[PDB]
Design a protein around this ligand. Structure first.
Ligand SMILES: O=C(N[C@@H](Cc1ccccc1)C(=O)N[C@@H](CCc1ccccc1)C(=O)CO)OCc1cccnc1
Length: 215
């Protein structure tokens, strides 16, 4: 694999978002992955709808949580592969409730054909990301309320509870690290991003890695 990758500098990553009071991290993780995969398939970088998932994917639980792999399966099985534009289905859950699903009045921004579940191995995840792009992952975020910048050490690694997006890595740094897009505004972390140490399963980062497939 390359020594380092950062998709943020290569036109593939949209702006950092704010999930607000809703437990919708799973939707921000899945949609951020689709946005990146859609661009890397040769389509324009398009802002896509988390609200579509939060309100309409009834195989997940709205502001009470969900699984990125359930979301990817719902898009293909129940929604004809479609992911709506943000502009046409804007985020409406910042107060902490999921409003009722709207089943018309939206425009398709992207489509997916399926998804892949990656091995529980940090080097194998990095190799896949270097070629195919950003990867949805779950982490234990319980220590992330102390993060201020730099490469975090000693992440509490007990129980997966938070969905986020791997956008790069650097194996050549003094301490090798992952680069992760969070959904807690740009005032948090490094303009909304966090770096964690790579190679010791920090925050359980290797355990539930997956990606949509755009054909
Ligand atoms: O809790 C979650 N998912 C987690 C993320 C996750 C993804 C993959 C592996 C492990 C963790 C999730 O969505 N977390 C939510 C919080 C969910 C929550 C809300 C109220 C009280 C307790 C917890 C987030 O916003 C993460 O920041 O899903 C429960 C679920 C499972 C299947 C169907 N519906 C819900």
């Amino acid at each position: 694999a390359p020594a380092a990758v950062d998709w943020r500098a290569r036109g593939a990553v949209t702006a950092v978002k704010d999930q607000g009071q809703c437990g919708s991290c799973w939707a921000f993780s899945a949609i951020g992955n689709v946005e990146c995969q859609w661009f890397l398939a040769g389509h324009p970088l398009t802002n896509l709808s988390e609200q579509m998932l939060v309100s309409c994917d009834k195989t997940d639980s709205g502001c009470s949580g969900g699984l990125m792999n359930n979301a990817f399966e719902w898009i293909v099985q129940e929604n004809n592969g479609a992911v709506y534009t943000e502009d046409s289905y804007p985020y409406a859950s910042g107060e902490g409730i999921s409003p009722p699903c709207t089943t018309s009045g939206h425009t398709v921004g992207a489509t997916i054909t399926g998804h892949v579940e990656l091995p529980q191995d940090e080097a194998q995840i990095a190799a896949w990301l270097a070629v195919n792009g950003p990867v949805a992952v779950a982490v234990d975020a319980s220590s992330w309320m102390t993060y201020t910048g730099g490469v975090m050490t000693s992440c509490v690694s007990e129980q997966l509870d938070h969905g986020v997006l791997l956008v790069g890595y650097n194996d050549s740094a003094a301490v090798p690290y992952w680069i992760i897009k969070n959904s807690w505004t740009t005032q948090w972390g490094e303009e909304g991003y966090i770096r964690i140490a790579k190679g010791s399963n920090q925050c359980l980062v290797k355990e539930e890695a997956s990606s949509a497939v755009v054909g």
